[PDB]
């Protein structure tokens, strides 16, 4: 596989062999067996392609070295900071053999791969846009006159994101196969993730997108401030919701409804302000609703969780939703303290952005169409998920450390339980009762939009938003 298609497979083998390279560069039997086997595979590939392997290793080393650099000094500045000279990323120039890692490669059945865009140079300015560990944004200049922006992350595991992206690609193929969804252009937005080590990785930067939280509840120029100025600020809503956390459930409900009454959705104006032509506005709103529907259904099938405001991006040009930070999945969010009680995020802002009809119109029908496609392909999806979950390095089971981080062999049993739960979801068996596609969609919608469920959620989830 590596000999025939080196660009698709070389990075994965290097990542397996370079799992522990972070500590080496800075200053269980299965693990060393895997490392030795990956070393043998890389030795063979270098035997057939020396230059490619050497260049890819140098690029990976440069990426890792860039990752461990501390950016606390420049956390405040957003304009951009020049890369330090000692970083090996700047010295790299004219890398003809290596293809851009954060790029999709159309798989060629013939193995020449003659004409591909390749790295030429790296821009000397890296930009900071926020984050928990301050990820760095860098630009890669390709062989042609184009600029590719990449996101370099450290002290984080990106393998889970990559495999979630692969499952999303498979779901996209399944949706494309069906005529009913193909007519509606129902797709799941995807991005390329290239993990470099256990704690370091690089992944595509989605240009032209903005987080929904940044657009909605920004304190200085958020939508809820420019619009509805007399309503509660986001700070007051968050403070009240944090204060009512320790109280009883009825107090939580009363406080939540009080906040929601004085905090009204203003997300509908996104397409209105960005697209002034009514035809373009209608097209973008339809695309937004369809993206929300397909994302919600796919996330429910895979049990996606932790869908807070900062984990969703909206493309300014296309008005489509992109989901990031896919670490928590397979209904593991319900195992958390103060558990998540919604299949997907369908709060008042997302519903309002759909239109005056809300979920009554295109959203519901797209949900039934996606659900029907999910049902018709239940066996293939079951096989894909079964292959995925038994990955030794997949690490999906929730542990107390992640439980505390998110909110500031038993593996076989939990895995087979997740498989049976997913099977019940796919066949439509909910709470022990078989349901039609329409009935299952209605149940999911009512569970998502119920203020009773929203009130019990973590204030970090920002249900009122």
């Amino acid at each position: 596989i590596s000999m025939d298609h080196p660009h698709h497979t070389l990075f994965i083998i290097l990542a397996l062999a370079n799992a522990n390279r972070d500590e080496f560069l800075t200053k269980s039997q299965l693990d060393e067996d895997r490392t030795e086997a990956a070393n043998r595979i890389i030795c063979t590939i270098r035997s057939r392609r020396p230059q490619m392997v050497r260049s890819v290793e140098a690029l990976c080393d440069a990426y890792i070295i860039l990752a461990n650099l501390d950016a606390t000094q420049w956390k405040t500045q957003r304009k951009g900071i020049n890369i330090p000279a000692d970083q090996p990323i700047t010295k790299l120039k004219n890398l003809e053999d290596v293809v851009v890692p954060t790029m999709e490669i159309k798989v060629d059945h013939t193995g020449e791969y003659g004409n591909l865009v390749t790295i030429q140079s790296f821009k000397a300015e890296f930009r900071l846009a926020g984050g928990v560990n301050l990820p760095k944004i860098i630009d890669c200049v390709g062989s042609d006159g184009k600029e590719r922006r990449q996101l370099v992350k450290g002290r984080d595991d990106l393998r889970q994101d990559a495999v979630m992206q692969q499952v999303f690609q498979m779901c996209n193929t399944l949706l494309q196969r069906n005529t009913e969804t193909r007519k509606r252009k129902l797709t799941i937005c995807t991005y390329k993730v290239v993990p470099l080590s256990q704690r370091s990785g690089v992944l595509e930067w989605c240009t032209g997108t903005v987080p929904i939280g940044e657009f909605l509840v920004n304190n200085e120029d958020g939508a809820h401030k420019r619009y509805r100025p007399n309503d509660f600020s986001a700070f007051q809503c968050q403070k009240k919701m944090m204060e009512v956390q320790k109280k009883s459930f009825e107090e939580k409900y009363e406080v939540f409804m009080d906040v929601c009454q004085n905090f009204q959705p203003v997300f509908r104006y996104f397409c209105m302000e960005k697209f002034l032509d009514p035809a373009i506005w209608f097209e973008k709103r339809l695309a937004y609703t369809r993206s929300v529907a397909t994302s919600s259904i796919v996330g429910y099938i895979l049990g996606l969780g932790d869908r807070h405001v900062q984990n969703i991006l909206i493309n300014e040009q296309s008005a489509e939703l992109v989901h990031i930070d896919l670490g928590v999945a397979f209904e593991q969010g319900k195992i958390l303290p103060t558990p998540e009680t919604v299949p997907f995020r369908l709060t008042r802002d997302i519903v309002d952005g759909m239109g005056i009809t809300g979920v009554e119109g295109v959203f519901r029908r797209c949900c039934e169409k996606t659900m029907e496609v999910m049902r018709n392909s239940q066996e293939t999806l079951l096989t894909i998920v079964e292959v995925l979950l038994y990955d030794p390095l997949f690490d999906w089971t929730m542990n107390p450390l992640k439980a505390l981080y998110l909110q500031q062999q038993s593996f076989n049993k939990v895995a087979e339980r997740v498989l049976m739960r997913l099977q019940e979801k796919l066949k439509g068996v909910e709470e022990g009762t078989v349901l039609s596609v329409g009935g299952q969609v209605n149940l999911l919608i009512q569970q998502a939009i119920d203020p009773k469920n929203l009130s019990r959620l973590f204030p970090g989830w920002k249900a009122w938003v």
């Binding site: 005529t179 193909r182 007519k183 509606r184 252009k185 420019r226 619009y227 009204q264 509908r268 104006y269 209105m272 302000e273 002034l276 009514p278 035809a279 373009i280 506005w281 209608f282 097209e283 339809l286 239109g355 005056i356 009809t357 009554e360 119109g361 295109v362 519901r364 029908r365 797209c366």
Partner: protein, 819 residues
């Protein structure tokens, strides 16, 4: 001379035919212009992007040189030809000059469909910029300019023949995008100041109107240029604009002059403003006084009211002579007036009078009523322009919407009446948001409140707006008390294609208007496969009836041609199709071609009439034109001698065109597949040879199998059984085994009779086993497929234990079994 070359060529080309004496000079000029100057760098591109010369004895030389020049550096592919067509379409000319380009586009389209497969696949990522939508809308605009001109009939026929070649392909888009000039947007982006943008727009419009034939508009236009260029704003415009390259820059250079003192407009102020605009008669026009009304309104704006901008108060001479300039300039006038407003007097006055105007359009004689559509479109354009601008308060886009106090429900209803469906939906959304906003400060509730005060129900309005848009899913979104009405139930029925329910409800309800009732009954019967019942119903409808309204005749003719009932004897689509099939039966090919041409022209004209906002409005006409095209194609095959090979490639073309129509709706797919089988059965009925009768039979059998598969795909069960019945009628099977029998088994499975399909398929397997040991290469595929289908069906229904299913059926298929 690159700029004006195409105009000269398009003017000189037609005059060749008229008379030989002028033809000699015209031909000499064209020859010197093209053939002599091919070896020139400047004119090479302009000659390359030129309309091909007409194919005649006169133009062989010119055509040869043009073809040689165009295909230099390589020939063109399918895509290329389309890009060249649009690129030469960028040049503006009379529609008659494009006839040869239309013919060449048609030929290139019919030669290759496998390439349109590749274009359709490529345009999947960004459906908006797909070239197919652009080509269709380009042909449609070229048709609109063709109306009321000398060569409308020939142009429309070519446009329809081109549109029939593509057919109703699924474009994966919703809204038609009108073409916009790329340099125009860049030029507007160039000027940051609002007044400079007005300068550029007005000067561009005046430069464009400088060339028009009428001498009066030129006399005022030149004065307008002299006045505008003289002021300070003109000088700023010139210094900021001289950097770019544009022919208007060279055209306007002699007009510009250097003077020490800039021209100062008279800033005279009336003693009391608002006096001219206070009259109600000014704002509300009469039925046919739009041309005078717009001029009077514009000049009243110019009459000593506001107009701080120095550009304005200089446009009156041009506004007086031309009305197009008047509706062009009105929104800018109103924006300038409201910009300088103090104490909000202008805002209140204009809001009140605009409300009066918009209420007068929706009042439906009456004292003010039936306002012409052009005036409504003008005021809608004013509102649209005002919405985009930013208010002096530096507020937000929602505030920017309310430059004037507007009840957007009325404006949305007017826009819907004017066919601006997306604009109507946006205005309805704005009105709902505003209503909720004022309600909170102090859909069913909003709908009843709107019905109580404004007299227009909001939910109903959204209903017809979403219905005009044509998107299927959005229809179910609108809801209220109106689903109880039988009409809404019926339309929901035919939208979902539950034809039995629609037929029952149509029969039951009598309050429905009669014509709609019989139309729905006939349509439901036709889609249910009840052809004989429909024929007898139509025959019985004759008694106790007056003259039929045209829809009854149209439906009767459709039933006649679809049912092959040839005894029965402006022309509409199905009437023309029936007459064409009769003429093909009677070998009167001249009338056949004439009727097909008339039908094409009528369909294209009918599409030309409407506003063309949603792509869904285009699909029925595309289907009709494709049907006409296939009929015309079969006409030449039948007229001359018919061979087996020609049948082969025509059927191959049929599968290719069907492959292009993979994602199209069944409502558009079914008429073509009906016409195909009718034509094939005509060929059967009048072939008169033993050898080719079998070939026609095989083609009909394959077509009917494909029709059955297509109907099964769309969950329609009546049509497949009718197709199987026809296959029975034309193919008596003595061998007992055939490919279509497997399709019959699949159809019976689809109708939820497992025993029937299972019995047929086991009988087929036994006959196949007895007949041969799968040595026959043709029967290997059918035998393997029958075995596999039987195994899968028995596994699904659990009528047989797994061991027998595996050993006898599924393993047998593998053992039995170049693409």
């Amino acid at each position: 001379l690159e700029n004006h070359l195409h105009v000269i060529v398009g003017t000189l080309i037609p005059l060749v035919y008229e008379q030989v004496e002028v033809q000699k000079q015209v031909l000499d000029l064209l020859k010197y212009l093209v053939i002599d100057n091919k070896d020139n760098e400047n004119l090479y591109i302009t000659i390359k992007l030129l309309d091909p010369f007409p194919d005649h004895v006169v133009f062989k030389d010119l055509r040869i040189t043009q073809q040689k020049i165009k295909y230099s550096r390589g020939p063109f592919s399918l895509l290329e030809e389309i890009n060249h067509f649009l690129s030469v379409s960028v040049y503006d000319a009379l529609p008659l000059t494009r006839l040869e380009g239309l013919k060449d586009l048609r030929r290139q389209l019919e030669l290759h469909k496998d390439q349109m497969v590749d274009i359709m696949r490529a345009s999947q990522d960004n459906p908006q910029d797909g070239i197919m939508v652009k080509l269709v809308v380009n042909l449609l605009q070229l048709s609109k300019m063709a109306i009321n001109h000398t060569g409308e009939k020939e142009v429309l026929e070519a446009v329809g023949s081109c549109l029939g070649e593509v057919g109703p392909i699924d474009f994966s888009t919703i809204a038609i995008q009108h073409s916009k000039d790329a340099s125009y947007t860049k030029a507007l982006k160039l000027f940051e100041d609002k007044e400079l943008q007005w300068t550029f727009i007005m000067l561009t419009y005046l430069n464009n109107t400088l060339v028009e034939d009428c001498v009066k508009v030129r006399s005022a236009a030149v004065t307008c240029l002299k006045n505008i260029l003289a002021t300070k704003t003109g000088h700023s415009f010139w210094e900021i604009y001289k950097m770019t390259t544009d022919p208007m820059l060279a055209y306007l250079q002699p007009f510009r002059t250097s003077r020490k003192k800039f021209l100062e407009v008279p800033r005279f102020d009336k003693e009391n403003p608002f006096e001219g605009l206070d009259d109600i008669n000014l704002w509300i026009p009469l039925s046919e006084n739009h041309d005078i009304w717009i001029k009077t309104l514009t000049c009243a704006f110019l009459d000593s009211g506001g107009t701080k901008c120095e550009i304005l108060q200089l446009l009156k001479p041009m506004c007086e002579v031309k009305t197009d300039f008047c509706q062009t300039v009105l929104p800018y006038l109103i924006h300038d007036i409201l910009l300088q407003d103090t104490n909000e007097s202008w805002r209140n006055l204009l809001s009140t009078h605009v409300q009066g105007f918009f209420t007068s359009c929706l009042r439906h004689h009456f004292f003010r009523c039936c306002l012409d559509k052009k005036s409504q479109r003008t005021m809608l354009a004013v509102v649209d322009y005002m919405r985009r601008q930013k208010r002096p308060s530096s507020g937000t886009i929602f505030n920017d919407a309310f430059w004037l106090d507007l009840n957007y429900l009325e404006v949305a209803k007017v826009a819907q009446s004017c066919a601006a469906h997306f604009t109507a939906l946006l205005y309805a959304e704005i009105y709902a948001d505003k209503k909720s906003m004022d309600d909170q400060e102090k859909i069913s509730s909003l709908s009843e409140k709107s019905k109580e005060e404004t007299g227009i129900s909001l939910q109903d309005l959204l209903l017809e707006i979403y219905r005009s848009i044509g998107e299927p899913d959005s229809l179910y979104g609108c809801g209220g008390g109106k689903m109880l009405q039988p009409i809404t139930r019926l339309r929901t029925y035919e939208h979902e294609a539950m034809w039995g329910k629609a037929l029952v409800t149509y029969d039951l309800e009598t309050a429905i208007p009669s014509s709609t009732r019989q139309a729905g009954i006939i349509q439901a019967l036709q889609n249910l496969g009840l052809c004989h019942i429909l024929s007898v119903y139509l025959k019985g409808l004759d008694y106790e009836n007056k003259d039929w309204c045209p829809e009854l005749e149209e439906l009767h003719y459709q039933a006649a041609w679809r049912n092959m009932q040839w005894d029965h004897c402006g022309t509409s689509y199905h009437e023309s199709l029936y007459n064409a099939l009769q003429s093909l039966r009677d070998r009167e090919f001249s009338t056949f071609y004439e009727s097909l041409k008339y039908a094409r022209v009528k369909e294209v004209e009918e599409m030309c009439k409407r506003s063309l906002e949603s792509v869904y409005s285009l699909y029925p006409t595309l289907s009709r034109l494709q049907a006409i095209g296939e009929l015309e194609s079969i006409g030449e095959l039948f007229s001359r001698s018919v061979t087996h090979r020609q049948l082969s490639e025509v059927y191959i073309k049929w599968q290719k065109h069907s492959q292009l129509l993979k994602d199209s709706d069944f409502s558009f797919q079914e008429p073509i597949m009906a016409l195909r089988t009718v034509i094939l059965e005509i060929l059967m009925e009048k072939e008169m040879d033993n050898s080719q009768r079998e070939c026609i039979k095989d083609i009909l059998t394959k077509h009917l199998v494909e029709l059955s598969i297509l109907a099964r795909t769309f969950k329609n069960t009546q049509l497949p059984e009718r197709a199987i019945f026809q296959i029975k009628q034309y193919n008596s099977v003595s061998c007992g085994v055939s490919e279509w029998q497997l399709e019959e088994a699949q159809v019976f499975w689809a109708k939820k009779e497992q025993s029937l399909a299972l019995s047929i398929l086991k009988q087929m397997i036994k006959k196949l086993d007895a007949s041969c040991a799968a040595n026959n290469p043709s029967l290997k595929l059918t035998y393997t497929e029958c075995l596999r289908v039987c195994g899968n069906w028995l596994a699904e229904t659990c009528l047989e234990n797994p061991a027998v299913i595996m050993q006898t059926y599924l393993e047998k298929a593998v053992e039995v079994a170049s693409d």
